[PDB]
């Protein structure tokens, strides 16, 4: 009997598909527990206002305010203690 | 009502709170330092209770190192055995104390039980009282000596401790190696009757099994001495170990005994009530069997690991079906396809088995338990245990690997039933076998932890089946938290 | 002391195996007698 | 994203004590399990049941030539449709 | 990370015992423990 000349090295197919499965599954969580220091803010509200403020000065195109506000936001990032200092919700 | 209000509402100041080791060092450091440590230890405790020449020296030391290491290994194994000895001792020592009271009865023939008890509020594990000279010199001496006698004693108490395991071993082996009609039918029924009630699983049943054994052996005797061939009893070795099974069972009765255990309308309504007290009362016995509160320790993890091992056993049994019982290259598997439906059915069944076992673990409902036992028994009996299984050329020649799988499932099922006896899944704590945390334990668990696909299956099942406020993110992060923590 | 009690078990078992080691009617009689004593063995020793 | 969560909780705060709702776990778990199990056995089921299928090819022509030396085919015969008799099961049994 | 173990199995414990607020309470505590490294190290300093 003859069959059309699919079904070659199927174990390959198996191994690569399952390792692709591994890639996605580890992708969902690989080090996401590391990405646990950014989701605790009670209100990122002031961060919003300042970031749109840097955008504002962007169109109004003032010189030092730009890098000034970028450095402030960067410092806000540096300290978690600072991410939480005033972000504690209004009493 | 703040479901996520607490996630960001947390305060901080309030938040803050108010043996083999010689083998290790010898593999690391010069073992000469290790023996110097061992004898200087000997020195310290004994105080407590009160370079060609160098080449031959290292070689002689090496010979001594080998002797010392062997001695250390036996001591460590002995320590493990000793751990078993303490649990058995609980029984041994309480029995010794009561025996001494009996000794008093022999010396003083009188009758007061409570008075002799008084020399020894009515229920205590510890009973500190007067102490009799012979007992103390006896254990002190026994403790003082040991080179291999420790092993002998350990054998004595372990065998006493096991009590019923060997009967299981013999029953499974005899039928698996030789399976006549009775030899194969009897085990399933004996397991089911046995795995029912903790105080006394079989009121009189053990005797029924043993009596069957004497009559069948007698039958064999006359058999050596036609229609007889029709019966599923065949010429073979005169006997292998049935006498040993019978002696072991007799010892079982002796131990139970030594410990102490047992072993107008008027007439029409009376007859109906009697019938109710036989069969409906038996149904009530099943109900009390299924009633709440029997207490035994719970170890889910041993079941889960045993199950995965069972899958390992099954998967190992794949190439043997082919013309290659040696786990050869995959190409043969590609080019053989020697009736592969059985592999898929078995694997599907075992995965379903794992799913249901976890489901029972989380919800602890009886129907799952019964489903487990019934499905396993029917599967084993229908799938195997007659001429059709010998469809593969596995009559008895290599017909042990499937049997190997058979007993492993059998032990698992029995321990599963024991777990049913304990129940109590709600109360949990880490597996003490895992909680021994040994580097070997650590390696085994991590290897379990490196296999593909584990994370999603465990996370998804627990997530659906855990019944509190929980997001997929929080819980899955928690498994990650467990990974770093361990 | 182990010889005393443990040998009692030993003698009962060994006589049983001696009865069963060779094929004979005499042996079957010994094995059946062994079971008979065996069931009451604890009682027989207990009794006078 | 974090503001979105805050906004939702402000206007959609789950009542305390619900703990969870069963149906949504049914849904999410079912979809996850079906997707993963299906992918796990997709090659397995495909090779088990579906897996190239043998198609019988039967010679539609047979030609036989008897030739001596290099002179000329002394004989040459070709049979194609009616002289190619497929085996009947009875003939197979006889063979 | 010992105390973290005990508290995480404690959240599991309250999980089977299925009490209402303790769950989210202990999840929030563990989350706060993560937030501050200063806090990861406050009492985790080994017993003296
Ligand atoms: C054959 C093909 C099959 C499909 C194959 C593809 C499968 C794709 C799977 C896509 C999954 C999408 C999941 C969407 C989940 C929405 C959950 C939402 O409804 O709940 C909210 C929670 O979800 C959050 O809003 C989403 C948070 C995401 C945080 C992590 C971001 C991850 C990094 C960026 C995404 C990267 C994705 C990479 C992979 C694509 C709040 O819940 P709550 O109000 O209490 O309950 C109210 C009742 N509900 C749930 C019915 C509405």
Element (H, E) at B284: helix B265-289
Cα–Cα distance measured from residue A85 to residue A47, given in angstroms and rounded to the nearest whole number? 13
Residue labelled with tokens 């855990």:
B466
Cα–Cα distance measured from residue D32 to residue D42, given in angstroms and rounded to the nearest whole number? 15
A 10 A CB-CB count for B444 gives 14
Cα–Cα distance measured from residue B135 to residue B152, given in angstroms and rounded to the nearest whole number? 20
Q: Which tokens belong to B399? A: 């017909």
Backbone angles phi, psi at D78, to 5 degrees: -130, 130
Backbone angles phi, psi at B137, to 5 degrees: -65, -35
Q: What is the DSSP letter of B326?
A: T
Cross-strand bridge partners of residue D75:
D66
Q: What is the DSSP letter of D48?
A: I
CA distance A3 to chain D (A): 5
Q: Is B8 exposed, middle or buried (0-12, 13-18, 19+ CB in 10 A)?
A: buried
Q: Which tokens belong to B230? A: 């029709």
B463 alpha carbon – ligand 1 mean position (Å)? 15
Cα–Cα distance measured from residue B5 to residue A89, given in angstroms and rounded to the nearest whole number? 11
- Pick the closest to residue B300 from B435, B143, B479, B121 (CA basis): B435
Q: Which tokens belong to B192? A: 């089911």
Residue nearest to atom 20 of ligand 1 (CA): B471
| Contact between chains at E27 and B428 (C-beta distance less than 8 A) | no
Provide the CA B290 distance to its chain's centre, in angstroms: 23
Q: What is the DSSP letter of B322?
A: T
Backbone angles phi, psi at B214, to 5 degrees: -65, -45
- Pick the closest to residue B224 from E36, C23, A54, D68 (CA basis): C23
Cross-strand bridge partners of residue D67:
D73
| Virtual torsion, Cα B451, B452, B456, B462, nearest 10 deg | -30
A 10 A CB-CB count for B463 gives 20
DSSP labels for B340-404? Answer: THHHHHHHHHHHHHHHHHHHHHHH--HHHHHHHHHHHHHHHHHHSSSTGGGGSS-SSSSTTHHHH
DSSP labels for B116-149? Answer: HHHH-----S-------HHHHHHHHHHHH--SSH
- Pick the closest to residue B197 from B286, B300, B293, B297 (CA basis): B286
Cα–Cα distance measured from residue B59 to residue B66, given in angstroms and rounded to the nearest whole number? 11
Method: cryo-EM
> Would you say E40 and E33 are in contact if contact means Cβ atoms under 8 Å apart?
yes
Residues whose CB is less than 8 angstroms from the CB of residue C42 and which lie 6 or more positions away in sequence, other chains included: B254, B257
E17 in B contact zone (CB under 8 Å): yes
Q: Which tokens belong to B238? A: 């005169």
- Pick the closest to residue B29 from B57, B65, B75 (CA basis): B65
> Would you say B38 and B22 are in contact if contact means Cβ atoms under 8 Å apart?
yes
- Pick the closest to residue B434 from B364, B475, B482 (CA basis): B482
- Between β-strands D72-79 and D62-68, what pairing exists: parallel, antiparallel or unpaired? antiparallel
DSSP labels for D74-87? Answer: EEEEEE-SSS--PP
Cross-strand bridge partners of residue A2:
D55
> Would you say B185 and B209 are in contact if contact means Cβ atoms under 8 Å apart?
no
Q: Which tokens belong to B336? A: 């053989």
HSE (side-chain half, CA atoms, 13 Å) at B97: 18
The end-to-end CA distance of chain C, in Å, is 21
- Pick the closest to residue B384 from B355, B348, B409, B419 (CA basis): B409
- Breaks in chain C (C–N > 2.5 Å) following residue: none
> Would you say E19 and E27 are in contact if contact means Cβ atoms under 8 Å apart?
no
Cα–Cα distance measured from residue A35 to residue A33, given in angstroms and rounded to the nearest whole number? 5
Q: What separation in angstroms does the CA of D59 have from each of B147, B461, D84, D89?
A: 83, 58, 8, 19
- Pick the closest to residue B164 from B89, B250, B289 (CA basis): B250
Cα–Cα distance measured from residue B342 to residue C1, given in angstroms and rounded to the nearest whole number? 58
Q: Is B368 exposed, middle or buried (0-12, 13-18, 19+ CB in 10 A)?
A: middle
Element (H, E) at E47: none
Q: What separation in angstroms does the CA of A38 have from each of A84, B283, B429, D50, E41?
A: 11, 60, 33, 49, 20
Query: 3-class SS at D68?
Result: strand
Q: Is B175 exposed, middle or buried (0-12, 13-18, 19+ CB in 10 A)?
A: buried
> How many helical (H) and strand (E) elements, i.e. helices and strands, does chain C have?
2, 0
Q: Which tokens belong to B342? A: 């059985």
Largest separation between any pair of C-alpha atoms in chain B: 111
Regarding the beta carbon of D12 and ligand 1, being less than 6 Å apart is answered: yes
DSSP labels for B143-174? Answer: HH--SSHHHHHHHHHHHHHHSSHHHHHHHHHH
Residues whose CB is less than 8 angstroms from the CB of residue B245 and which lie 6 or more positions away in sequence, other chains included: B166, B167, B170, B171, B174, B213
Q: What separation in angstroms does the CA of B45 have from each of B42, B48, B49, B352?
A: 5, 5, 6, 57
Helix, strand, coil percentages for chain C (3-state, nearest 5): 90, 0, 10
Handedness of CA C16, C19, C23, C24 (dihedral sign): negative
Q: What separation in angstroms does the CA of B237 have from each of B220, B240, E16?
A: 10, 7, 56
Cα–Cα distance measured from residue B455 to residue B444, given in angstroms and rounded to the nearest whole number? 17
Provide the CA E47 distance to its chain's centre, in angstroms: 18
Q: How many CB pairs under 8 A join B and E?
A: 59
Residues whose CB is less than 8 angstroms from the CB of residue B179 and which lie 6 or more positions away in sequence, other chains included: B385
| Contact between chains at A25 and B330 (C-beta distance less than 8 A) | no
Query: 3-class SS at D62?
Result: strand
Chain E residues near residue D17 by CB distance under 8 angstroms: 20
Q: Label residues B72-92 b or e (16+ Cβ within 10 Å = b).
A: beeeeebeebeeebeebeeee
Cα–Cα distance measured from residue B373 to residue B66, given in angstroms and rounded to the nearest whole number? 50
Regarding the beta carbon of D24 and ligand 1, being less than 6 Å apart is answered: yes
> Would you say B101 and B116 are in contact if contact means Cβ atoms under 8 Å apart?
yes
Q: What separation in angstroms does the CA of B42 have from each of B21, B45, B455?
A: 16, 5, 49
> Would you say B249 and B210 are in contact if contact means Cβ atoms under 8 Å apart?
yes
Range C29-37, long-range pairs (CB < 8 A, 24+ positions): C31/B214, C35/B214, C37/C12
Q: Which tokens belong to A72? A: 């402030």
> How many helical (H) and strand (E) elements, i.e. helices and strands, does chain D have?
3, 2
Backbone angles phi, psi at D79, to 5 degrees: -125, 130
Q: Angle at CA E4, nearest 5°, toward E3 and E6? A: 60
Cα–Cα distance measured from residue A47 to residue A41, given in angstroms and rounded to the nearest whole number? 11
Residues whose CB is less than 8 angstroms from the CB of residue D5 and which lie 6 or more positions away in sequence, other chains included: B4
Query: 3-class SS at A9?
Result: coil
Backbone angles phi, psi at B108, to 5 degrees: -115, 110
**B with C: 3 or more CB pairs under 8 Å?**
yes
Cα–Cα distance measured from residue B78 to residue B149, given in angstroms and rounded to the nearest whole number? 10
CA distance D21 to chain E (A): 14
User: Where does residue B433 fall: left (phi above 0), alpha (psi -120 to 50 degrees), or beta otherwise?
Assistant: alpha
**E with A: 3 or more CB pairs under 8 Å?**
yes
Cα–Cα distance measured from residue B287 to residue B292, given in angstroms and rounded to the nearest whole number? 10
Cross-strand bridge partners of residue D78:
D63
Residue nearest to atom 1 of ligand 1 (CA): D35
- Pick the closest to residue B346 from B321, B386, B392, B383 (CA basis): B383
Alpha-carbon radius of gyration of chain C: 12
| Contact between chains at A10 and D6 (C-beta distance less than 8 A) | no
**Which ranges of B10-148 would DSSP assign to H, the alpha helix?**
21-28, 31-49, 52-107, 113-119, 133-144
Handedness of CA D25, D28, D31, D35 (dihedral sign): negative
A 10 A CB-CB count for B176 gives 20
Cα–Cα distance measured from residue A90 to residue C8, given in angstroms and rounded to the nearest whole number? 88
Other chains touching E, judged by 3 or more CB pairs under 8 Å: A, B, D
| Contact between chains at A44 and D3 (C-beta distance less than 8 A) | yes
User: Where does residue B392 fall: left (phi above 0), alpha (psi -120 to 50 degrees), or beta otherwise?
Assistant: beta
Regarding the beta carbon of D42 and ligand 1, being less than 6 Å apart is answered: no
Q: What separation in angstroms does the CA of B429 have from each of B434, E8, E9, E11?
A: 11, 12, 8, 12
DSSP labels for B241-268? Answer: SHHHHHHHHHHHHHHHHHH-----HHHH
Q: Which tokens belong to D55? A: 């198609």
Residues whose CB is less than 8 angstroms from the CB of residue A91 and which lie 6 or more positions away in sequence, other chains included: none
HSE (side-chain half, CA atoms, 13 Å) at C37: 13
Regarding the beta carbon of D8 and ligand 1, being less than 6 Å apart is answered: yes
> Would you say B296 and B377 are in contact if contact means Cβ atoms under 8 Å apart?
no
Element (H, E) at B330: helix B330-336
Query: 3-class SS at B470?
Result: coil
């Amino acid at each position: 009997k003859v069959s059309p000349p699919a079904g070659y090295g199927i174990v390959g197919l198996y191994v690569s598909i399952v390792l692709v499965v591994g890639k996605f599954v580890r992708g969902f969580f690989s080090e996401i527990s590391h990405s646990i220091m950014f989701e605790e803010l009670p209100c990122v509200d002031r961060i919003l206002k300042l970031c749109q403020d840097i955008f504002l000065v962007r169109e109004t195109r003032e010189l030092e305010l730009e890098e000034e506000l970028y450095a402030k936001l960067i410092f806000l990032y540096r300290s978690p203690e600072t991410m939480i200092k005033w972000t504690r919700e209004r009493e | 009502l703040d479901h996520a209000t607490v996630i960001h509402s947390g305060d901080y100041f309030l938040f803050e709170s108010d043996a083999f080791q010689m083998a290790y060092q010898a593999w690391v450091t010069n073992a000469q330092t290790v023996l110097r440590q061992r004898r200087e230890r000997a020195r310290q405790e004994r105080a407590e209770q009160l370079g060609r020449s160098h080449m031959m020296q290292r070689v002689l030391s090496t010979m001594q190192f080998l002797w010392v290491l062997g001695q250390a290994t036996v001591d460590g194994l002995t320590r493990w055995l000793r751990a078993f000895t303490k649990h058995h001792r609980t029984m041994s020592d309480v029995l010794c104390a009561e025996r001494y009271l009996l000794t008093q009865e022999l010396l003083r023939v009188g009758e007061v039980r409570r008075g002799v008890l008084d020399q020894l509020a009515s229920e205590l594990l510890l009973d500190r009282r007067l102490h009799i000279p012979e007992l103390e010199e006896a254990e002190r001496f026994e403790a003082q000596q040991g080179r291999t006698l420790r092993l002998l004693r350990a054998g004595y108490q372990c065998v006493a401790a096991h009590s019923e395991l060997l009967c299981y071993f013999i029953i499974i082996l005899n039928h698996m190696v030789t399976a006549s009609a009775a030899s194969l039918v009897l085990p399933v029924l004996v397991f089911l009757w046995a795995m029912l009630t903790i105080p006394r699983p079989s009121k009189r049943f053990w005797m029924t099994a043993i009596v069957f054994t004497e009559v069948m052996v007698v039958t064999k005797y006359l058999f050596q001495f036609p229609p007889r061939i029709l019966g599923l009893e065949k010429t073979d070795s005169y006997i292998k170990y049935d006498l040993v099974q019978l002696m072991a069972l007799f010892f079982h009765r002796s131990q139970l005994l030594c410990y102490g255990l047992w072993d107008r309308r008027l007439q029409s309504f009376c007859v109906s009530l009697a019938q109710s007290f036989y069969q409906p009362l038996q149904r009530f016995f099943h109900d009390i069997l299924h009633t709440k509160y029997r207490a035994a320790t719970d170890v889910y993890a041993l079941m889960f690991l045993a199950d995965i091992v069972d899958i390992i056993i099954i998967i190992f049994g794949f190439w043997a079906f082919g013309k290659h019982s040696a786990a050869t290259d995959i190409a043969s598997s590609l080019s053989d396809d020697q009736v592969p439906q059985a592999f898929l059915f078995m694997l599907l069944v075992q995965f379903g088995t794992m799913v249901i076992d976890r489901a029972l673990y989380l919800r602890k409902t009886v129907l799952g338990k019964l489903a487990f036992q019934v499905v396993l028994v029917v599967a084993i009996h229908i799938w195997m245990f007659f001429i059709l299984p010998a469809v593969t050329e596995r009559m008895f020649s290599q017909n042990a690997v499937a049997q190997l799988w058979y007993f492993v499932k059998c032990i698992y099922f029995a321990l599963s039933a024991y777990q049913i006896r304990c129940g109590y899944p709600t109360r949990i704590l880490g597996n003490f076998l895992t909680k021994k945390y040994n580097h070997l334990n650590l390696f085994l668990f991590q290897g379990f932890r490196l296999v593909p696909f584990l994370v999603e299956l465990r996370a998804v099942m627990d997530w659906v089946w855990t019944d509190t406020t929980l997001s997929l993110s929080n819980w899955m992060c928690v498994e990650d938290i467990y990974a770093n923590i361990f | 002391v182990a010889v005393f009690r443990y040998l009692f078990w030993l003698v009962l078992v060994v006589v049983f195996v001696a009865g069963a080691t060779r094929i004979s009617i005499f042996g079957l009689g010994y094995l059946l007698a062994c079971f008979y004593l065996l069931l009451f063995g604890t009682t027989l020793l207990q009794k006078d | 994203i974090i503001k979105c969560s805050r906004e939702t909780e402000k206007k959609y705060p789950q009542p305390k004590g619900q703990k969870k709702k069963k149906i949504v776990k049914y849904g999410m778990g079912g979809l996850i399990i079906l997707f993963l199990i299906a992918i796990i056995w997709f090659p397995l089921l495909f090779m088990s049941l579906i897996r190239v299928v043998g198609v019988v090819n039967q010679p539609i022509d047979v030609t036989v030539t008897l030739k001596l030396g290099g002179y000329e085919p002394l004989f040459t015969m070709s049979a194609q449709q009616p002289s190619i008799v497929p085996f009947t099961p009875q003939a197979y049994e006889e063979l």
